[PDB]
Structure formats: structure tokens, C-alpha cells
């Protein structure tokens, strides 16, 4: 699988040795090239995963993530074109290195064949993002933003490490294939429930879980524009991809003690969606809506119904995209006005009509309107939950109450309505914003026509 | 200290230390310590400021007392066994009597008090010698006697060292005090695995040594001892403070950096010995270490800090000083994780 | 290599190089008192090489080509502004003093290097133990606030105490009213704009702190300006100066090594001029300090280590 | 003055310098370029040439193999009357039921 | 109120992050800041010997 790994490793000499003017022209022109190279990984067998080597392998679950990450990397490049034009060239090369290194650690992480190799490359991603969030951030609190990020993720990461080595000494291998074939029932002993607690709370923290979610509002809001998309789009989803992987040996204790988490997600998803409708900062909305959708997929894995694993993958990519346009859009209002208050800028179609067109179709994508894979994945979660419990619908049905209650709400107060006559700052839309808008939303309608590949391994 | 004699000032410290590894007789192991001790004092006062004489003396009473206890632990063992060879002690109290002394040599237990205190007065160069070299000699003795150390003794004193060592770091602003508490916590990390396997304590000792080497290299190069003075260094030399960050990440042990492997391998070995609660506890407590690493990094390179105008005078000149080997230690102590199997060479 | 570990071990004793004519000398006087030409007279008559008065761009003279690199890129101060309007928000007075005293630190550091390495003496104009005259004078003139003074003299004792006082210090005594009349006939508009009390104040600090607290230090041989024109009178007093009092005689090769270690590497002689104090006239925020260095980076030559920049013309870099 | 600081710089509107700007860089020739890069592969061969690749996977997950096989198997047991697939697959002959 | 001001901005942010970070902050100075007089330091060494030798009695 070094088809994709090495050219990204080499991309660091590429950007570092590139000339003064190109750099970003260089950075994109080859990151797109790597994207179609990673588009090859769409070749799955039925159920036997693509085992490329002893340490690297991929399956129907990992591959959609790989294409998401690799194709994402050009997007923050062009997204960061505006924000970081003033800075000198050397840090420009360093910033791209952080982006490439981040995507580098992502692709190996999703493709590791040994659990600890996944873990070492799991939390290896906070190191570059901590640099991105803290150094290149904009507002003052960004200092405390990074601390909240790493400490939250680490507070659960270390228990996983102690658990992982324990399984190594107990079973003899943490490799996905061996642990899957030699999967054994995790008994109900108090020792084993804490083992389950160790192997789950790590992903739950950066899931996030209701109550264990403060980092995203304190990080995504003050993260740099490029950094903000990457966190929500994919760096949310390491825990998820790990979660469906480690859940092969935690049975049957999962069906017995997932209730507190199924609780905290269900109430949290309504709670997060409701508070999402009542923030004064637009950037907090995509952050709070993100966890609301993200709280949904934790429900999927807990019931571990085949249908639940169906929508877990689809919603992951769907939301992972969905947060991307909104953060891109929410960015576009910011630097134009140097504020993230939706109240300050209202009715932008009277000034930016094309931006509004992109705004609404991303919004209705967040609405989970079929045939978009946002709904079908999200819908499969509903069906699995009903199989788990018929009553489940009402609490989550309350989530199909708040989403559109806010997901069109900023539309009618950011892109829709009248304009304040004092902001002459608002200007025409540079084609970059619409162009990246095109590569952002056009895919989601494209693979909508063909949902089986991003459906997941349960096909 | 006269340059020519300053060399032999350090020569007997090294050979006095080297006597500890190579000897097989308890008195010789005892002799190697004061030769280290008696010659370690003057270099601590090479600058010879009232703080330096302050720093040296607290070392002396602490170290001389520890060697004094070291002496009887030999004698009671001799009285109850009649052998001087470096093997297990044959009398339990003599064992605990030694382990108590070597800790004060090492700054593990509440004895850790003397470590941050002396580091302030003694210069950065002297500190470079203290937290790095002055730990090799006690570790060698502990590795040899590892057969018959009380496991609940070593573990308890190791656990506290990472506890206070990490916790005391979250108060300081002088880099030397912060550095000493970081060393104190790392003192606990090696010593926790000491009874189970002694290969890991060497491995963590090595990683600790090169990282603390490279760490002080940067501090001398930045020529700063206070966070504000270090905060200035973003202007004159951004490369120094840029790498200041990366090795500070290896401090916390955050992968894929080198600093993870000591914590990683120790947790693995300890879990093989069915101790899971203890490694988990130090794993959490290590976050306190990482916290004042992050704040130290924050005031270093993530955020620019107010500089001065007379510092643009400095732009004209450069470091005429070098000391070789800083480029090697940054690399060796940051990118070595893909070479974990090389730890078997120590075995 | 410079005088260091190996050199002392090899046998480099500066006492062997130090001789009678090995003297660090400087001439002090009022503003445009003419201590300069008298410094010229004691230079070539007593076979002695001379360092000019330290200026704003004296460091730019030491490194590179000698040209005064842009003031914004070197010292961000001008004595024109200080002489024209010294009482402003920018506080150009202390920015001038801090930079100039730092230049005097360098201008004295290499003077010690000349004596220590070669043994051939140095003639200076003023010295490190002369800038407290101006700062004390101008503070008394309502020119700055008190906090600047307490930080200047603090860094002054931090640095100057390390070095060694000069062998002999000459003085050109001139009446203050003559100096005021002297400036009236110069013509440069900036030096018209002076306060007569300031002209008496430098004389006061010269006759209250400099000459009294430096007589017992090394040597005061206060020479009148009227005795100063007769260059023979000043220079004849010099070799017939026993110069017993002072820390020079009790300067063994041990203290010589410690002095040369400090003054050889230029980053430690002025290491303590960037004391992290927060005076308004001394602290530049992040944005300028970023940009200005980025300017100094593309400033010719001064980007890499000297002799390693292709823009200058340095060759054979691949095997350098 | 306290902290000597530059005034906050004003946003550089790319369109005012060249009113054919693209939000890519100051220089127009590189600016029109950066479009021809993204408006190259980005939309051209990642989406369009990408779509034909992903939409023309050779038997992704062999669902057609099961299809024609499912056609193939059901007629066999329907030809001889067997009720196609059976409640159990690991047939009772080779398993070892406890006691 | 119940969403941001009560629970999210305060309560969940009070229990785990603020309180635990306070605990680190609260007892740091009890263990980090010390008087510095030499007498008490070795006085502290005293009781450490007995508790090691007598209280838990690592010898037994």
C-alpha cells in the first residue's frame, strides 16, 4: 500500500524545496495527484480485506476514510490561501508540512494492521494539530484551546495503552486479523468491565460524548480555518474507525453496559442540537451540530447492529464532509468581517448570491435529505435503533426536530434576509471560495448515486 | 577553576563514577562515590557566587549523609554475611538501609527536596553535569542489587517521585527548577521498572540522558534561565526555540517522538508482571509533566513575545561558541521510535 | 581558535603580551569639548592605536562593511530627534542611551581584546564608565522618567562589573560657557537646541561621579583644555604615570582568561543588555520584531553565518 | 505608547490591484495560473475521470457473483424439490453435539 | 440557561476540567513551594527513615 504512503512522505521535500511563488501551486497540484492515487483503494473484495503487507492493510471500512483524508489535503491548502498569504515563505513551507504530516499520520493510522501500530499513529496526530491550533490560531483563548484538546484526548488514550499491552500479554497478538479470528467473549468480571472501560473511553472522549465534549467548542471555534475543518472532518473519526475494530472482542459486555453511553448520546444529541440552535457564534453551531451527528454514530456502534454499522460509515463521511463546507463557508464570512457573529452579517445573497447557493445546498445536506448518503446512513441508524428498541425513535425523532430548526436558521440570518447598510467590506466572491465549494459539495451528490462503496464493510 | 585543573576536576568525577560500574567490591563501590562527591563540589562553585556556595553545601550534607548510610548497609551486610561482592544483601534491614541511602543519592523519595534546590544556584553547565552524570553511579548499584530489593519499597518511592516530581513542576518559572522537577519525575520512571527488568531502566536512562543532554545544550545556546528571557529567544534565534518545542514534546512522552518509548516499554514490561494499576497511575501523573512542558513551549515558540530594540544589536554577531554534539542529540532524542528493537542490544 | 581552553593549556599568557605601553586609554570631556583630537594626539605620539567614539552604528562598523545599516534596522533611534525634541511620547532619549551604551560596551569589549591579544594599547573616546554622565544629566533635565534610569544603571553594574577598568583615563577640562558659545558657532541646527543646564550637568556628573569615583579606580590627571592643545603636555604626563592604584596589577593569568572568555564571544558581552524589563522605550512588540528581523534577514550578507552567504559572494559553499 | 506596536494592517483586497483576481496570490499571472491548476485536475480528472473509475469498479464485492449463483443454486433444489436453503448449514453429520 | 449557562458552559466544564486542574493547581504549592531552610529538609528525612523502617517496616 506504499503506493500512497511514500508520495506523501516525499511531499515534505517537495514543499520545502519548492520555489517562493509556487509552493501552494506546487502543494495542490500534487496533492490532487495523490488523491486519485488513493482513489485506487476503492478496490475491495467481498469480506477479505486488502492485506498489502505484514503491517499495512485496508478494508471496506478504512478505504472511504483514506480517500476522504487524501482528497481533503488539497482543500485546506486552497482554504488557507487567503488566511496565510501575508506570512513569510519559510513558515509557509512549515505550515504545509504540518498539513502533509497530519494527513501522513492519518493514512497510516487508518491502515495499520497491528492495534498498537494504530495506537502509536492514532494519537500521533495531536502533535501536528496542537501546532496548528495553537501557533496559527487567531483569537486569544487559542492558548487554552490546545491544552483542552490534547489533555482530553490523552486522558483516555493512556488507559487504552495499558489495556492494549495487557491483551498482547494475554492473547499473544493485537493484530486485527488474529484478534478477529481468535476473538473470545469478554466476561462480566469487574476486571473485565474495567478492561472494557479502558478500551472504549479512549475513543469516547474524542467521539465526543455528552459531557466529554468541551474541547470541540473551545478548539474548532478558535482553530485556524484549515485546522478547524480537518479536526471535524476526519480527526473526529479515528475513534470511530478504531471503535468498530476493537468491538470484536468486547462482546458480550457491550450489550450489557453500553446503556450509560447510549443514554448520554441520546439525551446529548437532543441537548447538543438544542443548544446549537441557541449560540451567538456561527462557528460554534457547526461544532455543536457536529457532535450531534457524531453522538448518533456512537449509538450505531453500541447496538453493533449490521444496519447500525451501515450508517456509521456513511454518516461519518457525510458529516465529515458536512462540517467541511460549513466551516469553509463560516470562514468566508469571517475574514470579510473579522468576526464570527451571525447577527453581524445577515442576508448575504443580496451581496453574494452564489455563496448563498452553496450555503443552502450544504445546509440541506446537513438536513439529511434523500437520496443524499447523509440520510440513508443516518436512516439506517434509526432502523437499527428501532430493532434495539422501538421507543428509541422519539428521542432521536426529537433530533429530526432541532437540526433543521437550526440548520436553516443561520441561512435566514446569514445568507437570507436583508443587509446592514454599514458593511462596505463585503465584496465579490473570489473564485477560490466557490471553487473549493465545488470540490466540497459536488462529491457528496456524486457518490450519493452509488452508496455501496461508502456504505461500509457490511455489504 | 583553572582550565587545566578544571579538566582533572571533571576527570576524577568520571573515573570516580566509573569506579562504581567496574568494581566488584563493596568498599570500592563506596570509594567511587566520594571521589565523585568530593570533586563534584568545586565545579558547582566554578562560577563562585553566594548562590553557588549555597547550592554546593546543601548537596554536600545531603550527599555525605547518603554515603554515610551507604557505609553501614555494607557493614551490616558484611556483619551478617561476611562478603564484599556486589550481590544480594543477606539481611533485610541492610537492604532497606541501602535503598534508603541510594535514593538520597538519587532524589527519589521526599529526599527529592535537594534536587531542585541545588540546581538553581549551580550554573546551567553544572546542572548539565548534575542531572545527567550524577545519576549513572547510583543506578549501576541498584541494577546490580536488583535481585533482593523489596518490590513494595522501590515501587512506593518510584511512585512518589513521579508524583511530587510532576506536581512540583506546576509552580515554577525558572527553567532550572522546572528542569529539575522534570528530572525528578523521570527519576521515578526508570526506578519503577527496576525490580521487574533492569534492561528497561537502562533504556529509559539512555533516553533520559540524551534528551536532558540536548535539553541543556539548547538552554546554554539560548543563554536563558527565566521563561521571560527564554521568551525573548524567538526573536534572535527562532531555530533554537523551534527545536525547543519538539524536544519539549519528547518530554511529555507524546508519540511518535522518542520520549514515548521509555514510558511505552516500561508499561509493557510491568503489565507482563501483572501490575496494571501502578503503570496506569504513573501514566496519568505523567500528564502533569507534559502540562508545564506545554506552558514552557507556549512561552517559547507557539506565541511570539515582546522583545527589545537593543537585541537587534545581537543580529550582527553570532554564537562563537559551539559545543559539538547538539545536532546529534536533537535527532537521537526525537526520531528513534522506529528503532525500538535495538533495546535488545542493552540486554 | 581564539584564546580558550586549548590556548591557556598551550601557554598563552596575556601577561607576557602585556607591557608598559599596553594601556587602555580614553579621553573624556563635555559635549564638543574636543576630547577627540586630544585622543588623536595621545594615540600616535605614544605609539597607540585608537578606537573612535562609539556611535549608533558602531556595531555596523564592526561587522560587515562598516556602513550604517538603516536606522530602523540598527538602533531605531536618532540623536537628531533627541537634540531637537527630547521630551516626547516615543522617549527617544533612552532609546539613544541604551543603544549607545550597548555600542560602548562593544566599543570597550574589543578594546580589551586588543590589549589582551596583541598588547598594543587602545585610545578610546569616553567609555562604559562615561555614559552614566549623560543619562544622569538628561534625567535631571526633565528628559525621561525614573524607571528608565533604574533599569539602565542596573544593567550597567550587571555588565561593567565583569570587565576591567582602563589603565589611564585622560580628561580635557573645558568651561561650560565656552562649550555653549562653541555650539552657537557650529551651525548644525540640532546642536543649537540644547539646554545650558544640560551642558553644566554633564560637567557636574563628570566632576561629581566620573572623576571622583574613577580617580581611586585607575587614574585621574585632569588636564585643562588650555593644557590640552599642547599635546606634549598631555602625552608627557602619561609615561610618567606609575598607575599603581587599580585592579590591573592584581590581574593574574587566571583573571585574564576569565576576562577574555567573556569579551571574546560577542553574544555574552552584551547578553545582559536585553534584560527582560518592560520600559515603553525599550520593548518592541511581536509584529515589528518579526518584520524588522525579516528585513534584517534580507539585509545584504546578514542572513547566514558570515562567510556563508552567496549574496555577498562567498564561494565554495558546498565544501565550506 | 507603552508597547510600541504597528497599526493593524488593512486587508489587501486582491480585486483592487487586478480586477481579475482569484483569491490566490498578488501576481495576476500566477493568479490566473492557480485557477488553471485547480480547474485542472481538481474538477477535471478527480471528479469526472474519478467518477468513471469509481462507477466502473470491476465487480465491487462480487454482488453479481452471488446474484448469478443465487439464480444458479435455487433452481437445483427447486428442480429436485428441496426447500432451497436449510435451517442449518453445518449439517448434523459432521458436528459433535455435546453428549 | 439549562443548555449553555447551566450545564455546558459551567457544569460539565466544572466537574472534570476545572476541578481536576484546580486540584493540580491547589496542592502544587503545598508540595512545590518550600521554606528553604536546611534544618527542616533533613528533619523531613528523619521520619522517612522510621516509616520505612518501622511503620510499614519494609524490612518485614
Amino acid at each position: 500500500m506504499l503506493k500512497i504512503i511514500i508520495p506523501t512522505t516525499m511531499l515534505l521535500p517537495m514543499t520545502w524545496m519548492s520555489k517562493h511563488n509556487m509552493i501552494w501551486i506546487n502543494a495542490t497540484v500534487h496533492s490532487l495527484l495523490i488523491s486519485l492515487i488513493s482513489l485506487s483503494l476503492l478496490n475491495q473484495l467481498g469480506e477479505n480485506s486488502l492485506n498489502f503487507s505484514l503491517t499495512f492493510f485496508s478494508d471496506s471500512l478504512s478505504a472511504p476514510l483514506l480517500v476522504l483524508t487524501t482528497w481533503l489535503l488539497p482543500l485546506m491548502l486552497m482554504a488557507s490561501q487567503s488566511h496565510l498569504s501575508k506570512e513569510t515563505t519559510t513558515r509557509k513551507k512549515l505550515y504545509i508540512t504540518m498539513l502533509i504530516l497530519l494527513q501522513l499520520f492519518l493514512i497510516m493510522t487508518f491502515t495499520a494492521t497491528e492495534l498498537i501500530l494504530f495506537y502509536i499513529l492514532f494519537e500521533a496526530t495531536l502533535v501536528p494539530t496542537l501546532i496548528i491550533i495553537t501557533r496559527w490560531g487567531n483569537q486569544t483563548e487559542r492558548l487554552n484551546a490546545g491544552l483542552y484538546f490534547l489533555f482530553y484526548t490523552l486522558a483516555g488514550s493512556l488507559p487504552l495503552l495499558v489495556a492494549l499491552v495487557y491483551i498482547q500479554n494475554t492473547t499473544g497478538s493485537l493484530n486485527f486479523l488474529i484478534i478477529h479470528y481468535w476473538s473470545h467473549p469478554l466476561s462480566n468480571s469487574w476486571s473485565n468491565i474495567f478492561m472494557w472501560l479502558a478500551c472504549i473511553m479512549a475513543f469516547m472522549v474524542k467521539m465526543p460524548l455528552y459531557g466529554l465534549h468541551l474541547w470541540l467548542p473551545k478548539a474548532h471555534v478558535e482553530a485556524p480555518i484549515a485546522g478547524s475543518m480537518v479536526l471535524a472532518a476526519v480527526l473526529l473519526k479515528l475513534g470511530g474507525y478504531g471503535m468498530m475494530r476493537i468491538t470484536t472482542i468486547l462482546n458480550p459486555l457491550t450489550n450489557y453496559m453500553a446503556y450509560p453511553f447510549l443514554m448520554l448520546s441520546m439525551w446529548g444529541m437532543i441537548m447538543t442540537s438544542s443548544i446549537c440552535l441557541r449560540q451567538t457564534d456561527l462557528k460554534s453551531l457547526i461544532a455543536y451540530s457536529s457532535v450531534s451527528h457524531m453522538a448518533l454514530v456512537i449509538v450505531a456502534i453500541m447496538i453493533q447492529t449490521p444496519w447500525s454499522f451501515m450508517g456509521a460509515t456513511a454518516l461519518m463521511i457525510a458529516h465529515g464532509l458536512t462540517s467541511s463546507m460549513l466551516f469553509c463557508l463560516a470562514n468566508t464570512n469571517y475574514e470579510r468581517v473579522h468576526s464570527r457573529t451571525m447577527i453581524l452579517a445577515r442576508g448575504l445573497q443580496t451581496l453574494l448570491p452564489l455563496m448563498a447557493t452553496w450555503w443552502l445546498m450544504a445546509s440541506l445536506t446537513n438536513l439529511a435529505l434523500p437520496p443524499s448518503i447523509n440520510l440513508i446512513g443516518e436512516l439506517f441508524i434509526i432502523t437499527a435503533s428501532f430493532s434495539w428498541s422501538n421507543i428509541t425513535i422519539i428521542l432521536m425523532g426529537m433530533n429530526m426536530m432541532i437540526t433543521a430548526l437550526y440548520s436553516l436558521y443561520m441561512l435566514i440570518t446569514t445568507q437570507r434576509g436583508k443587509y446592514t447598510h454599514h458593511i462596505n467590506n463585503i465584496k465579490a466572491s473570489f473564485t477560490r471560495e466557490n471553487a473549493l465549494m465545488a470540490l466540497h459539495i459536488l462529491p457528496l451528490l456524486l457518490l450519493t448515486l452509488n452508496p455501496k462503496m461508502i456504505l461500509g464493510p457490511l455489504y | 577553576m583553572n582550565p587545566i585543573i578544571y579538566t582533572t576536576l571533571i576527570m576524577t568525577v568520571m573515573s570516580g563514577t566509573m569506579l562504581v560500574m567496574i568494581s566488584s567490591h563493596w568498599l570500592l563501590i563506596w570509594i567511587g562515590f566520594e571521589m565523585n562527591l568530593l570533586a563534584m563540589i568545586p565545579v558547582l562553585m566554578k562560577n563562585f557566587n553566594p548562590r553557588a556556595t549555597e547550592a554546593a553545601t546543601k548537596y554536600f550534607l545531603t550527599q555525605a549523609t547518603a554515603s554515610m548510610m551507604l557505609m553501614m548497609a555494607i557493614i551490616i551486610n558484611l556483619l551478617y554475611s561476611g562478603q564484599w561482592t556486589i550481590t544480594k544483601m543477606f539481611n533485610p534491614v541492610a537492604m532497606t538501609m541501602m535503598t534508603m541511602a541510594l535514593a538520597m543519592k538519587l532524589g527519589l523519595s521526599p529526599f527529592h527536596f535537594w534536587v531542585p534546590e541545588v540546581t538553581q544556584g549551580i550554573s546551567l553547565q553544572a546542572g548539565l553535569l548534575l542531572l545527567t552524570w550524577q545519576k549513572l553511579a547510583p543506578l549501576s548499584v541498584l541494577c546490580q542489587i536488583s535481585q533482593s530489593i523489596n518490590p513494595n519499597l522501590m515501587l512506593t518511592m518510584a511512585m512518589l517521585s513521579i508524583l511530587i516530581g510532576g506536581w512540583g513542576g506546576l509552580n515554577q518559572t525558572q527553567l532550572r527548577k522546572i528542569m529539575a522537577y522534570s528530572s525528578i519525575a523521570h527519576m521515578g520512571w526508570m526506578t519503577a521498572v527496576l525490580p521487574y527488568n533492569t534492561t528497561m531502566t537502562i533504556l529509559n536512562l539512555l533516553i533520559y540522558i540524551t534528551m536532558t543532554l540536548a535539553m541543556f545544550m539548547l538552554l546554554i545556546h539560548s543563554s536563558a534561565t527565566t521563561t521571560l528571557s527564554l521568551s525573548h529567544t524567538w526573536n534572535k534565534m527562532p531555530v533554537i526555540t523551534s527545536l525547543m518545542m519538539v524536544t519539549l514534546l519528547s518530554m511529555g512522552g507524546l508519540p511518535p517522538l522518542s520520549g514515548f518509548m521509555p514510558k511505552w516499554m516500561i508499561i509493557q514490561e510491568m503489565t507482563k508482571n501483572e501490575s496494571i494499576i501502578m503503570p496506569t497511575l504513573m501514566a496519568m501523573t505523567a500528564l502533569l509533566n507534559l502540562y508545564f512542558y506545554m506552558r514552557l513551549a507556549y512561552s517559547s515558540s507557539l506565541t511570539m513575545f515582546p522583545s527589545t530594540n537593543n537585541m537587534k544589536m545581537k543580529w550582527q554577531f553570532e554564537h562563537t561558541k559551539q559545543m559539538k554534539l547538539l545536532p546529534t542529540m536533537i535527532v537521537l532524542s526525537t526520531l528513534v521510535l522506529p528503532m525500538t528493537p535495538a533495546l535488545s542490544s542493552l540486554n | 581558535l581564539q584564546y580558550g581552553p586549548l590556548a591557556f593549556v598551550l601557554g598563552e599568557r596575556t601577561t607576557r603580551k602585556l607591557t608598559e605601553t599596553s594601556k587602555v586609554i580614553t579621553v573624556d570631556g563635555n559635549i564638543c569639548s574636543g576630547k577627540g583630537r586630544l585622543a588623536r594626539e595621545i594615540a600616535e605620539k605614544l605609539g597607540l592605536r585608537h578606537f573612535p567614539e562609539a556611535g549608533i552604528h558602531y556595531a555596523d562598523s564592526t561587522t560587515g562593511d562598516g556602513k550604517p545599516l538603516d536606522v530602523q534596522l540598527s538602533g531605531n533611534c536618532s540623536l537628531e530627534k533627541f537634540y531637537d525634541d527630547p521630551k516626547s511620547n516615543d522617549g527617544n532619549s533612552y532609546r539613544l542611551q541604551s543603544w549607545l551604551y550597548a555600542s560602548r560596551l562593544l566599543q570597550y569589549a574589543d578594546a580589551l581584546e586588543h590589549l589582551l591579544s596583541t598588547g598594543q594599547g587602545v585610545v578610546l573616546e569616553r567609555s562604559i564608565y562615561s555614559d552614566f554622565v549623560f543619562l544622569e544629566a538628561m534625567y535631571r533635565q526633565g528628559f525621561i522618567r525614573k524607571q528608565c534610569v533604574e533599569h539602565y544603571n542596573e544593567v550597567k553594574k550587571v555588565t561593567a562589573c565583569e570587565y576591567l577598568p582602563p589603565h589611564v583615563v585622560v580628561y580635557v577640562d573645558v568651561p561650560v560657557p565656552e562649550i555653549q558659545s562653541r555650539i552657537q558657532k557650529k551651525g548644525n541646527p540640532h546642536e543649537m537646541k540644547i539646554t545650558a543646564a544640560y551642558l553644566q550637568d554633564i560637567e557636574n556628573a563628570y566632576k561629581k561621579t566620573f572623576l571622583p569615583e574613577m580617580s581611586e579606580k585607575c587614574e585621574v590627571l585632569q588636564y585643562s583644555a588650555r593644557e590640552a592643545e599642547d599635546a606634549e603636555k598631555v602625552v608627557e604626563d602619561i609615561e610618567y604615570l606609575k598607575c599603581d592604584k587599580g585592579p590591573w596589577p592584581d590581574q593574574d593569568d587566571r583573571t585574564f582568561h576569565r576576562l577574555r572568555m567573556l569579551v571574546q564571544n560577542k553574544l555574552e558581552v552584551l547578553n545582559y543588555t536585553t534584560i527582560p524589563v518592560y520600559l515603553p522605550e525599550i520593548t518592541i512588540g511581536a509584529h515589528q520584531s518579526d518584520r524588522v528581523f525579516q528585513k534584517f534577514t534580507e539585509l545584504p550578507g546578514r542572513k547566514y553565518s558570515p562567510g556563508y552567504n552567496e549574496d555577498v559572494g562567498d564561494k565554495w559553499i558546498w565544501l565550506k | 505608547i507603552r508597547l510600541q506596536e504597528d497599526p493593524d494592517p488593512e486587508d489587501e483586497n486582491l480585486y483592487e490591484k487586478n480586477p481579475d483576481s482569484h483569491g490566490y496570490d498578488k501576481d495576476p499571472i500566477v493568479d490566473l495560473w492557480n485557477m488553471r491548476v485547480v480547474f485542472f485536475f481538481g474538477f477535471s480528472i478527480v471528479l469526472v475521470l474519478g467518477s468513471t473509475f469509481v462507477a466502473y469498479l470491476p465487480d465491487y464485492r462480487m454482488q453479481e457473483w452471488a446474484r448469478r449463483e443465487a439464480e444458479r443454486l435455487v433452481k437445483y433444489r427447486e428442480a429436485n424439490g428441496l426447500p432451497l436453503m436449510e435451517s442449518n448449514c453445518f449439517d448434523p453429520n459432521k458436528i459433535q453435539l455435546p453428549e | 440557561k439549562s443548555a449553555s449557562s447551566l450545564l455546558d458552559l459551567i457544569w460539565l466544564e466544572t466537574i472534570l476540567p476545572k476541578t481536576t486542574s484546580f486540584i493540580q493547581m491547589k496542592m502544587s504549592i503545598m508540595v512545590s513551594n518550600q521554606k528553604g531552610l536546611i534544618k527542616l529538609y533533613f528533619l523531613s528525612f528523619l521520619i522517612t527513615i522510621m516509616i520505612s523502617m518501622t511503620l510499614f517496616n519494609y524490612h518485614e
Binding site: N138 | N171, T173, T303, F305, P306 | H287 | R2 | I29
Partner: peptide, 26 residues
Amino acid sequence: RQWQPDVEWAEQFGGAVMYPTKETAH
């Protein structure tokens, strides 16, 4: 421009103890 630490921000980590109380005040 992004926020950068000012003079006041430095003073926070600028005391004899960067987080003080009454005992460490003097």
C-alpha cells in the same frame, strides 16, 4: 492579525512563582 501575547500576558508567567499566593507573595 492573530492575537499575540502583550506585556500583561508576560507578567502572568513573570513572578517569582508563576502562580502565587500569600506565602509566596513576599
